């Protein structure tokens, strides 16, 4: 059940922008610019306004009422607990009907370099014709990268080195330390190596999506099940199993990448695998 159509939402946004002297350019960002994303009910409206007077917007929130009644909103460049990590000033809003609008205000001066930030951008309005070469959105910066012999070694090095930090956390009875290093680093390097395997098998012309979220489409159900099994980490016993499964998958996938691209298979696996076994025995 829709309470508003997509055309009604775009009209609310653009009619507001057209009427306001301060707003000179409007762009669209994110998955709605991406012809390779299947449309669904969760696609945010990522809208950017380029404006002549920033402070006149920040002074009061009343002008936002045109977008509808809100369930929640965040102003991430205006919080105390969190520092600014994007330029400009944004409003992340979830509305009563489940629609989401992430609205960014940027000073007009930033238009000089804005288009270098991301290629998934579509120009919606340009009152003064500032944009002389109009960009065509593309997700090409998100395709799988081909490794080099050096970056392959680097990935193996970071995987196997950080494995030793999971071991330290488990042997010290500091499970949260072990979990964070597995989540933030060890399994991320495993997923990177898997992305290189996908590139070898299927090519370099498509994206696996943010957080590798499209990976399931491009790997065996057998390998997908194992990957998901590594995310059961709520005990020391489960964490040793997850870590050992992660190591087994990494051996199999990095060996395939090395043999397909004619790289040396490094000694990290042999040396750290023995280290893991010895440490586990010492504390068992």
């Amino acid at each position: 059940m829709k309470m508003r159509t997509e055309k009604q939402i775009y009209d609310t946004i653009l009619n507001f922008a057209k009427a306001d002297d301060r707003i000179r350019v409007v762009t669209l960002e994110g998955s709605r610019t991406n012809i390779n994303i299947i449309p669904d009910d969760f696609q945010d409206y990522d809208i950017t306004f380029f404006v002549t007077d920033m402070q006149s917007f920040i002074n009061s929130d009343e002008w936002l009422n045109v977008f509808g009644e809100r369930l929640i909103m965040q102003k991430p460049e205006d919080m105390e607990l969190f520092p600014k990590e994007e330029k400009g000033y944004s409003y992340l809003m979830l509305f009563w009907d489940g629609v989401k609008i992430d609205l960014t205000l940027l000073p007009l001066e930033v238009l000089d370099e804005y288009f270098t930030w991301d290629k998934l951008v579509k120009l919606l309005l340009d009152k003064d014709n500032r944009v002389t070469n109009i960009p065509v959105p593309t997700d090409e910066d998100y395709y799988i990268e081909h490794p080099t012999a050096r970056s392959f070694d680097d990935c193996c090095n970071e995987f196997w080195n950080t494995v030793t930090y999971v071991v330290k956390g488990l042997c010290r009875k500091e499970i949260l330390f072990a979990i964070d290093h597995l989540n933030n680093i060890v399994r991320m390097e495993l997923l990177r190596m898997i992305s290189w395997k996908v590139g070898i098998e299927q090519g370099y012309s498509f994206s696996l999506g943010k957080n590798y979220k499209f990976l399931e489409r491009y790997i065996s159900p057998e390998l997908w099940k194992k990957i998901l099994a590594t995310y059961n980490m709520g005990s020391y016993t489960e964490m040793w199993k997850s870590l050992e499964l992660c190591m087994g998958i990494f051996r199999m996938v990095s060996k395939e990448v090395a043999q397909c691209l004619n790289y040396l298979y490094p000694d990290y696996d042999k040396n750290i695998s023995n280290y893991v076994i010895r440490q586990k025995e010492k504390y068992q």
Copy 2:
């Protein structure tokens, strides 16, 4: 079974530094400077050398052989896959006997501001008496922070807003997106709120450690079990359970913090909890 004593390791490091004209200051960093850490077999030796000629060290690795035979080493400021994220040039080494040395080379000029970077620092050698006010190591920058009414609201805002991103990932059958947002953000804000609860209950004069790794000492076994149960995430069914458990813990703990510090309890819980229930039903 030790193959080398701590005194032998320190002697290997300092005798090397004393003999070398290029090295003028040596410091120790990390948990070995921290009198509140219980010593164990996994404490790295975090050593920093301040040197007159950086490039003469980087040219060749032979000089590292004095530290022993290595199982693995990383040179993180000299990789292709990973950009530099620390100043200077470091060597992360794990040795044949399980000893770990993380050795950082820094130019002498950086000594002007180095001591502002971290307070868990101990001066080991200063050939020219460059350090006139000698620092005393302390972990005080790692104690629990007292929230303000604004930062309390900010934490609640980020928790409940990001809950909606876990919902989106689960409803889209994009579980890796949902898992990453729960791991990187949702549960981190839960752990932050729990740290504030600990501060109220037990005070502001101690550290919960990196990755909150000492948290188990300061919360009920009952609450610890629930926290660990949230880390079972290897299926859509498990992820809905984890998310709902995370929300329940957050309600209980943020309510206690608000009532103890006389903050307003925000409407995020009510509004987003209903949103979650509706979305789960819509896709079930």
